[PDB]
Amino acid sequence: TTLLNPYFGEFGGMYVPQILMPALNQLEEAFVSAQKDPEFQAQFADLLKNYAGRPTALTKCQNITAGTRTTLYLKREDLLHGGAHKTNQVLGQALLAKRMGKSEIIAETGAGQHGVASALASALLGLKCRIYMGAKDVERQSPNVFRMRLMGAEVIPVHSGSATLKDACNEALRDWSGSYETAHYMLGTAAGPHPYPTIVREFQRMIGEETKAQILDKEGRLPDAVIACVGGGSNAIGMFADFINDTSVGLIGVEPGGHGIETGEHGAPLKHGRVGIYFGMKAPMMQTADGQIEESYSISAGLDFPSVGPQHAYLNSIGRADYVSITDDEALEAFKTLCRHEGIIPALESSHALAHALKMMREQPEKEQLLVVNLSGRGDKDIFTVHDILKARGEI
Amino acid sequence: TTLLNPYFGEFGGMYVPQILMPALNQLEEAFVSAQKDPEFQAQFADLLKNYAGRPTALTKCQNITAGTRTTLYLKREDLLHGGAHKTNQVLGQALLAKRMGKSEIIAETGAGQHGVASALASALLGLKCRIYMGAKDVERQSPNVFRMRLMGAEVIPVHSGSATLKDACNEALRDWSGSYETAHYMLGTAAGPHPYPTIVREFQRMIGEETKAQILDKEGRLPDAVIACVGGGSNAIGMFADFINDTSVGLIGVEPGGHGIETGEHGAPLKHGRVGIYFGMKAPMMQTADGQIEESYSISAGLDFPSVGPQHAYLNSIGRADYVSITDDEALEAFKTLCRHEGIIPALESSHALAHALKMMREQPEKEQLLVVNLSGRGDKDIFTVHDILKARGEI
Amino acid sequence: MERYENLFAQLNDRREGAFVPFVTLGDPGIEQSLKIIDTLIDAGADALELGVPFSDPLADGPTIQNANLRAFAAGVTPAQCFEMLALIREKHPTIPIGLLMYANLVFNNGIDAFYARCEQVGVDSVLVADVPVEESAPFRQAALRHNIAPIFICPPNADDDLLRQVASYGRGYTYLLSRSGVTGAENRGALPLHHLIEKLKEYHAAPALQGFGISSPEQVSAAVRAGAAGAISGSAIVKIIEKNLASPKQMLAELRSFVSAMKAASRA
Amino acid sequence: MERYENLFAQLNDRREGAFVPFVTLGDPGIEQSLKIIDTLIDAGADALELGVPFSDPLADGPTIQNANLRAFAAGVTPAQCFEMLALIREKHPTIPIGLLMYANLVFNNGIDAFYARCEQVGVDSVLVADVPVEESAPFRQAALRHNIAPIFICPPNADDDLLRQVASYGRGYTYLLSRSGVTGAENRGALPLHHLIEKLKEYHAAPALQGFGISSPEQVSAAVRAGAAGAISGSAIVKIIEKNLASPKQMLAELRSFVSAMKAASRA
Ligand SMILES: O=C(NCCOP(=O)(O)O)c1ccc(OC(F)(F)F)cc1
Ligand SMILES: O=C(NCCOP(=O)(O)O)c1ccc(OC(F)(F)F)cc1
Ligand SMILES: O=C(NCCOP(=O)(O)O)c1ccc(OC(F)(F)F)cc1
Ligand SMILES: O=C(NCCOP(=O)(O)O)c1ccc(OC(F)(F)F)cc1
Ligand SMILES: O=C(NCCOP(=O)(O)O)c1ccc(OC(F)(F)F)cc1
Ligand SMILES: O=C(NCCOP(=O)(O)O)c1ccc(OC(F)(F)F)cc1
Ligand SMILES: *Cc1c(COP(=O)(O)O)cnc(C)c1O
Ligand SMILES: *Cc1c(COP(=O)(O)O)cnc(C)c1O
Ligand code: NA
Ligand code: NA
Prior knowledge:
heterotetramer, A: alpha/beta, Rossmann fold, 2 domains, 6-stranded mixed sheet, 4-stranded parallel sheet, 14 strands, globular, C: alpha/beta, TIM Barrel, 9-stranded parallel sheet, binds the ligand O=C(NCCOP(=O)(O)O)c1ccc(OC(F)(F)F)cc1, binds pyridoxal-5'-phosphate, binds sodium ion, Tryptophan synthase beta chain (chains A, B), amino-acid biosynthesis (chains A, B), tryptophan synthase activity (chains A, B)
C-alpha cells in the first residue's frame, strides 16, 4: 500500500526485491510529510537561495537568433553551485535524509557528476557520504573522483558485472537494503522505483517555476516550447512540470542520438528502445532481443542512463510531450556555437537541447517562436573531449 | 589635464609614453560620461543580472565556525558566470569599448583567467578579441587557451622578454598605442595607469554593495571585517569600496606569501616589495635592488601580478586597510577545509583570503567577530595543482 | 502438476526436511552444468532452485554474481536455459524444479508466454526476485494459469499484513529469509524464525523453506527443528564450482559429498 | 654644460644636419659596446643616444628588445653603464650624450641622485620613455638642477597644448616622432612634419631631431629639408650589431660604413 500512485499510466512502479519495500515506503511517507511541512520548505528554500544561488538567470540569445523570427532564452542551471541542475535535488534529498533521522548517504555515479553533487550536499549538511562508481569510470574520471574525495566522500570502486553505471546502481541498492535504518540512498535522476521519480521532479520543479515567472516578466506570455536534454529525465521534468497544465506550451525532450539512431550506437531508449522492467521500474530501456540490459552510448557520459524516467514515457504516450534525438556531431556544433556567439561553454548534455532548438530555428527561420532551452550545466568538464574530437578529424 | 585625480595620495598616476596619453584621456572621458548615463548603467545592470547571474549569494559557514564566536560568510563570486569576479568588470569595459565606437578588444593574460574573461565578454558583445599571453603560459595553460579559442578570441603567444605576464602586458600596450582608434585595451586588474584603477573599482563595487545589503538583512549590522585576496587588487577593492566610509569595518587584503616571506619566494609587494614606477603607475613592486622588475611567486598563478593597485597602497599608508600574507601551505589547508566542511571548491586565490579568516577565528576562538570573505572564484581549475602537491608530499 | 505437494507429503510421512540446492543454469558451461545438476539429484537433493543468467542480478551476492558471469562467458542464453530445463525434467520426473528469475526476463516476450514456456518444459515454480507482493498480480495470475507456483520471499521482519499476503499469494513453498541484514545491528528488526514459521502455518501458507546463508549441516537441522519444511543452499554449493573450475571431476565429487552431508542433516 | 647648444650652433654655421645614432649600452658586451660607440663617433656621429638595459623596455621595438636581452645576457647593470658613460665622455669631450631611460631606473635610488650621477659622468640629456609631459615635473626639475637637459617626445598628431608644453619644458633638442602609427590608417592623425617643425620654432622650442624609422640616407636629407636640425637612427644601427654578432670586426666595419653614409646625407 502506498500514499501516492507509483505509476504514470502503465510506466513506473516499485519493482524491487521485497526486502527494499520498507525503505521505499519510509521514504515516500517522509516525502509526503515534508511537502506539507512549512519548516522543511523554508529550510530547502534557504539552501537553494543562499548556498546554491537560486534563482538562476534566464539569458536571451540575440546573437544566435539574429535574422530569424526565433527568440531564444537559456535557463541558466550552468550557474547553479556545482555547475549543473543536479544540485537542486541532492539538497532536498539530503534534507529528507535528516528528516528520517539518517546520518549517512549512499549514491551511485556513472562518470562522477552525481557523485560530486551527492558529495557536496552531504558535506554541507554534515552527512557521511559513500559513493559507488564503476571501476572503469573511476579510472577515466580522475577529476570527479578527486572532487568527491576532497569533499570527504568515500569513493568505492565497483568491480562487479561490467564495472560501470549499472553495477554502481546495483551496489548502491545492495548496500541500502542492509543499511537503510541509518543511510539514505540519494538516487541521481527522476527514474528508479517510486517514490524517486516523483521526489526528484518535485525537487527540480523550481527550474520551470522560475522560467515561467521570468518569461512572463520579460515577454508577457508563456513560451511556445521548452526544450531539455534527457539522460534519465531530471532536468527535463524539472523544466516541464510547471508547464504540464499550460497545454499551449510544447515540452520537447532530447535524447542522445550518439553516432546516429540507425547505427544502434545511441542512448535514445524512450523512442528507440523497448519497454522492460529494470532499475525498479517499467520503462523503455536499451536491451537485447532476449531482454539483457544494455548500455546507452553518447559523446556525453552524463546522458548514458540506459532507460528513462517513467513520467517521460507517460507524457510521450499521451502526446503531451514530444521526444527527439540529437547526434554527437549536432551536439558538438551547438557547443561550438554557444561558446563563440554568447561566451557560454555549455555541458555536452545541455548542448543536445540547444542543438535541437538551433534546428527548430534554422529549418524554419521565418516561423515566429519563443523558445527556452534548459541549459542544465556548464561545459568546462567537456573541453578535453571536445578538443580531442576536433583535433582527431583535423577540424582544429 | 585630466577630469579625475590620477593619484591616490602619492600612488598611481599615468606613467606611460606620451603616444598613449590620448588613449587614456579618451577612456577617462568615456568613463566619466558613462557613469552619468542612466542608459549605460541600465545596460550594464542588464548584463550583470541576466547574463552573469548577479546578485551572487552570501553563504554562512556554520560548519567551519562551530564552537567559536566567529560568524563567517562567503560572498559567492565563485557563482558568477565564468567562475570568478573578473566577469563583472570585463562586461563594463566591453560596454565602454562600444561607447567609444570600438569594435575590437585587446587584453593581456598571465595563466589565462583574464584572457577567458575578456574573451567571453567580447563574444557576448560581438567584439573581435585578441589576447596576448606569454609563450611559457600558453604551453602550461592548454585549458584556458582552448576556452579562449572556443570563444572566437585570437590568442597571440608572446616570445619577447621572458615570455610571461609582464611581456604580455607590454605587447598589449604596444598594440593599443597604434590601434586605439578602433581597439580598447581591457586591462585585467585595478592597477596600471589612470583611469584603470578607478574604472575597475567602480565596475567591481557591486561586490561590496551587495555584501552590505545581504549582511544588513541577515545580521542587522555591518561586518566587523571583510577579507579579500590581493593579486592586482580588483576583487579586494570591489569588496572594500562601499565600506571605505564605514570606519568600523575592517578591510583586510591578503597577498600571497608563497614559500614564506623570508624565502623571498612570495608575491607580497605591498608589504614586502619597494615602491617603483612601472606598469604606468607608482606603486610597490617586486624588483631587484637596482630596479629591474621581478616576478611574484605563489602556488596560485592568479596572484602573480608583481605589483599592486595604487588605491591599496594608499589605503594601507593611511591605516584604513590592513594587509597581510598567507603562505602556499596555509592556502592549501583552507582549500581542503572549505571542500570538506562546506562542499565548495574555492579558487586557490580565494583560499588565501579564507586562510586568513580561519587564522582570525582559530587564534582567538572566543572573540566575537562577524567576518565576510570575498570568495573571488571557484577552484575546479586548481584540482591538478592541489592533487600534485598533496601526492608529492605523500599527504595523499 | 502437484510436485511440491507430493514431495512435502512424502517428506512429512518420513518426518524429514527438504534440502534444496540453488545453482545458476549453464555455470560453468551447459554440459558441465547438466552434470552438476544430475550430481546434486543423485546426492539427495529433494528439489532444485535454478537461476537464469541475467545481465544485472541485483539480488545476488558475490558468489552467485561470479556464477552469472561464468555462464555469460560460456554464451548461455535464456533460450538455452529452457532447453536445459526440458532435458532435466525428462531425466527426473518428480523432483520439484523452481526458477529464480528477474522481472525483465519474464516480461520480455510477454508474461503469459513466459509461464507457458515454463509449463511446457515442466518447471514447478518461479520466484521473480524484483517483483514484491505489492506488484505481483500479473505474475502470479500467469503462473497459476500455467500450473506454475509463484514463490514469494517472506522477510524475517515481515509485518502481519505482509505475512497474510505471502500466505495468500504464494504456492509450492514460502521462501523464508534467514536474515533481514548481515550485521547483528542490521538484523535487529528480524523476529524469531520459529514465531514466523508458526504464523505462516496459522495462515495456511505454503510450507516454509528457509534460505540465505545456509552453508552447514547444523543449519539444515536447525531449520527443521524451528518448524520449517526444509532449507535452501546456493552460495555454499556454487563456491564448490568456483573453487574447482580447473578440475571438473573433483568439482562433481565435492558437490556430491557436500549435498549428501546437507541432506543427511534433514533426516529423522 | 652647453654641448647641444654648441653643436647646433656649429652645425648651423655649416648649414648641416645632425646625425645621432642610438645603441643600447653593453650590447653585445661591455668591451664590444665601447668599441661600437667609438666607431660611431669616428664615422661622423654628431651626438649619441644611449639606452640603459631594462627588464621591461615597453617603448622599444623588436630590434632594440633583442639588444636589451643581449646586454642582460652579458650581465650588464646600470652601475656598469655609468662606468661606461664616464669612460666615453673622458674620450670625447664635446659630443652631446643623451640617455634613454625608463622611469623605474631613474626613480629607484632617488630622482635627484640619478641626475646627479648623470652630471658626474658628463651626460647631457635624459629622455624618460614612460614619463609623459603631464607627469614630468620632478624629472625635469632634477635634470635642470644637475645641468641635464630633459628631452620630450613630440608626437606628430600633438595638439597645440602639447606643442606648447613640449616647447616650454624640453631642452637640448625636441624629439620629433616620425609617425604616430605604423600603418597609413594608424598614422591618419599625424600632421605634416614641416608644419610641426614650424610650430616648434614659433614657440622657441629646442631644435628638433626627427626619430623613429630613419634607416636610409634619403630620410636624413628629408628631415633636414623639412626644417629639422637632424635625425636619430637606432634600429638600423642595432640591426648591424645583431647581423654580425659572430664577426665583431665585420660588425665595426659595417657600422662605420652605415654611419658615414647617414652623416654624409646631412651635409650641405
Ligand atoms: O540515472 C541514474 N543515475 C544517474 C547518475 O548520474 P551520473 O553520475 O551523472 O551518471 C539512476 C540511478 C539509479 C536508478 O534506479 C535504481 F536505483 F533502481 F537503480 C535509476 C537511475
Ligand atoms: O595584473 C594585471 N593583469 C591581470 C591579468 O590577469 P590573469 O590572466 O589572471 O593573469 C595587469 C595588467 C596590466 C597592467 O598595467 C599595464 F597595462 F600598464 F601593464 C597592470 C596589471
Ligand atoms: O538475496 C540476497 N542475497 C543473498 C542470497 O542471494 P545469493 O547470494 O545470490 O544466493 C539479497 C541481497 C539484497 C537484496 O536486496 C536488493 F537487491 F534490493 F538489494 C535482495 C536479496
Ligand atoms: O535462493 C536464493 N539464493 C540461494 C540461497 O541463498 P545463499 O545460500 O545465501 O546463496 C535467492 C532467492 C531470492 C533472491 O532474490 C530475492 F531475494 F530478491 F528474491 C536471491 C537469491
Ligand atoms: O618608440 C617606439 N618604437 C619605435 C622606436 O623605438 P626603438 O624601436 O626601441 O628604437 C614606441 C612604440 C610604442 C610606444 O608606446 C607604448 F610603449 F606605450 F606602447 C612607444 C614607443
Ligand atoms: O630614440 C629612440 N629609438 C631610436 C630611433 O628609432 P628607430 O630608429 O626606429 O629605432 C627612442 C626614443 C624614445 C622611446 O620611447 C618613447 F618613445 F616612449 F619615449 C623609444 C625609442
Ligand atoms: C546529470 C546531467 C544531465 C542528465 O541527467 P538528467 O537526469 O537526464 O537531467 C544533463 N545535463 C547535465 C549538465 C547533467 O549534469
Ligand atoms: C584574477 C583572480 C584574482 C586576482 O586578481 P585581483 O585583481 O587581485 O582580484 C583572485 N581571485 C580569483 C578567483 C581570480 O580569478
Ligand atoms: Na536514457
Ligand atoms: Na601583486
